[PDB]
Design a protein around this ligand. Structure first.
Ligand SMILES: NC(=O)C1=CN([C@@H]2O[C@H](COP(=O)(O)OP(=O)(O)OC[C@H]3O[C@@H](n4cnc5c(N)ncnc54)[C@H](O)[C@@H]3O)[C@@H](O)[C@H]2O)C=CC1
Length: 419
């Protein structure tokens, strides 16, 4: 009922925005548990810390204790906002940085700070297409077109669909914000220039979408693999099953080395390698990925032309993160090798200290399989991707892994699209 006579978009009508939010926020607060009241209060005081923490937690090792009360806030904020789901779409607004669209070209013209550079905006148009932008942590927004200057170059005009958990909160009763639950992504649906207060901003029209992404959800992940790839396991020829099994159990080292640059062990044969590759690849073509899905990979430095002892690989120095972002952002990288990925965001013991975390949008219809359906892959959550695809690099986001086992280092989250 609270959405009855509001529009989908309040535009600049700050007064209508307020009336709607007030009645909504009052009812929602009286529906909260004390633990939820407290956690939403914590989100007002330090939303940044909480959101940063959600990232650390999801990419952690299994035995990650973390910080107790922020585990609580993560849960309570999530259950809180689910008590305030929209009954019809709501457009919302917020100023945004270059970073969140993986864009590092200045959008301002050099001549007039009020005027957007034409070639910049053209590259931006290319860059934001064919990409779902994952939004980490919670996202709080506003109800109307901002009326004040921004130092940021972009205005996002974001459509929240029906049933989005989206709660009215805040200290300023005449400018209540909207608190959006975890787990969502952004898909652009338009680009234009808007002029607010004499200045031009790049306006991104976008839809808020939900991609399948299990993060730490082990029960859901495996249930998905079983349902979608047990028949696949049934149909494997003997040799296909054998050589998938060889690959998985340690054969990958020699197989991907060979795919990468043709290396053969002296006791190894060329023909054995080619036969193994042909049986694995043929297997990976038998049942296309049935729905868009995020998968993850702890990547070694060699995958970006870096050695473990290369100086450029020290991401604890600000300068090295910048030159890496300079080098790979927007780039398409061919992948000659099979790609071992995991559908869980969890760090993995054998690869705990790798600094490069792939977060891959794996499209419907890709030649890949949930191989851990096979017997004796308890605790394995692998999707294996056919060789010869490519990475479109969408974004690079740093976070700091404080853990002793993780390597007490900054690490780079590489959002990418398989093409
Ligand atoms: N790495 C991961 O996140 C996952 C690993 N696994 C399991 O781990 C084992 C595979 O270990 P990995 O080291 O991931 O195998 P891999 O053959 O992909 O990696 C071997 C080494 O070669 C490098 N490399 C890989 N692809 C390359 C390319 N295109 N160009 C240049 N260098 C490249 C890697 O950085 C790594 O140092 C398998 O048993 C698999 O089941 C399973 C799921 C995910």
């Amino acid at each position: 009922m609270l959405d009855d006579n509001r529009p989908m978009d309040f535009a600049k009508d700050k007064n209508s925005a307020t009336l709607w939010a007030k009645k909504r926020k009052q009812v929602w607060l009286n529906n909260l548990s004390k633990a939820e009241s407290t956690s939403i209060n914590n989100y007002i005081k330090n939303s940044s810390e909480i959101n940063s923490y959600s990232i650390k937690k999801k990419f952690a090792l299994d035995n990650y204790e973390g910080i107790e009360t922020l585990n609580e806030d993560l849960k309570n904020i999530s259950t809180a906002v689910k008590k305030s789901m929209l009954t019809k779409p709501l457009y919302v607004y917020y100023y945004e940085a270059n970073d969140k669209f993986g864009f590092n070209q200045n959008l301002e013209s050099s001549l007039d700070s009020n005027i957007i550079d034409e070639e910049a905006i053209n590259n931006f148009a290319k860059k934001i297409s064919d990409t779902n932008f994952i939004q980490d942590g919670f996202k709080d927004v506003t109800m109307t077109e901002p009326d004040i200057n921004s130092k940021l170059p972009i205005l996002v005009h974001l459509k929240l669909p029906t049933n989005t958990p989206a709660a009215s909160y805040g200290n300023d009763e005449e400018n209540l914000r909207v608190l959006i639950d975890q787990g969502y992504s952004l898909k652009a649906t338009g680009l234009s220039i808007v002029t607010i207060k004499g200045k031009q901003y790049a306006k991104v029209d976008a839809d808020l979408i939900k991609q399948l992404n299990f993060e730490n959800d082990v029960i859901s992940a495996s249930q998905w693999g079983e349902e979608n790839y047990a028949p696949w396991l049934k149909e494997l020829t003997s040799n296909e099953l054998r050589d998938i099994n060889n690959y998985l159990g340690g054969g990958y080292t020699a197989i991907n080395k060979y795919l990468l640059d043709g290396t053969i062990g002296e006791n190894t044969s060329k023909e054995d390698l080619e036969e193994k590759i042909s049986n694995i690849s043929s297997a990976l073509k038998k049942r296309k990925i049935p729905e868009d899905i995020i998968t993850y990979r702890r990547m070694g430095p060699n995958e970006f032309g870096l050695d473990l002892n290369s100086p450029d690989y020290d991401f604890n120095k600000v300068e090295n993160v910048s030159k890496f972002k300079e080098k790979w952002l927007g780039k398409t990288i061919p992948v000659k090798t099979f790609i071992s990925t995991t559908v869980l965001s969890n760090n993995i013991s054998a690869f705990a200290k790798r600094k490069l975390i792939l977060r891959l949008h794996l499209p419907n219809g890709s030649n890949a399989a949930y191989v851990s359906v096979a017997e004796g892959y308890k605790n394995e959550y692998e999707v294996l991707i056919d060789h010869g695809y490519s990475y479109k690099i969408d974004n690079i986001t740093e976070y700091y892994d404080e853990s002793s086992l993780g390597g007490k280092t900054n690490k780079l989250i590489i959002d990418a699209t398989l093409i």
